[PDB]
Amino acid sequence: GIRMTRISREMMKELLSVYFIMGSNNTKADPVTVVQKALKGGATLYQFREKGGDALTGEARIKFAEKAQAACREAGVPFIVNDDVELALNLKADGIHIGQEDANAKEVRAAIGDMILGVAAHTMSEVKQAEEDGADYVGLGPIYPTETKKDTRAVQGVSLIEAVRRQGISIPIVGIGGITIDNAAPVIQAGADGVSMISAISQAEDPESAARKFREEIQTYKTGR
């Protein structure tokens, strides 16, 4: 249900383990079917991100969001909305994710009560500002090269993740950008609480198996660090 209190850091870190993000234009298969498969395989959190070319709009976009949210309910996984604060409130989403060029975080926190709030950050200053504004987690990247999102900041590897932890900041962190089954380990080793991805799952020949592999791997990495 809706949160009457801010999510705990311990719980937030658990949800970030395998954070699947997807829109209808990120796969050649049926969108909802791919989300259902990712959830069955083991994704721990899902972000509805519908934007850019050939993306759905109007009520068609709302209906797709409703179907994806229903799939999350069936799987017992939280549903996060990207960018659209109004849609998140209208659908009773579990959270909202925003970036540096979107609505201001302090303004968004005030509009959503105790809903989960994620903020994309690329510098130490941005990470610190996000925490002060009331974010529950920060998405750091691009860790590796990605073409899924064109307008991205420079690739930073795990440098920022390491820098944040070295300064004593314990805010929940999820890495993003070109993450695959074979390169996720360093992200968790650097201090991240999880990995987020689009194409490694959305464009996989077997999305369920990919999600299951991620879930198994991340659990091992987190216990090993």
Ligand SMILES: Cc1ncsc1CCOP(=O)(O)O
């Ligand atoms: C949404 C987003 N934000 C920064 S990189 C990125 C794209 C992630 O896509 P992929 O996992 O396919 O690189």
Ligand SMILES: C=C1C=NC(C)=NC1=N
């Ligand atoms: C840019 C992003 C960064 N991090 C996350 C978790 N989602 C995003 N859309």
Ligand SMILES: [Mg+2]
């Ligand atoms: Mg954004």
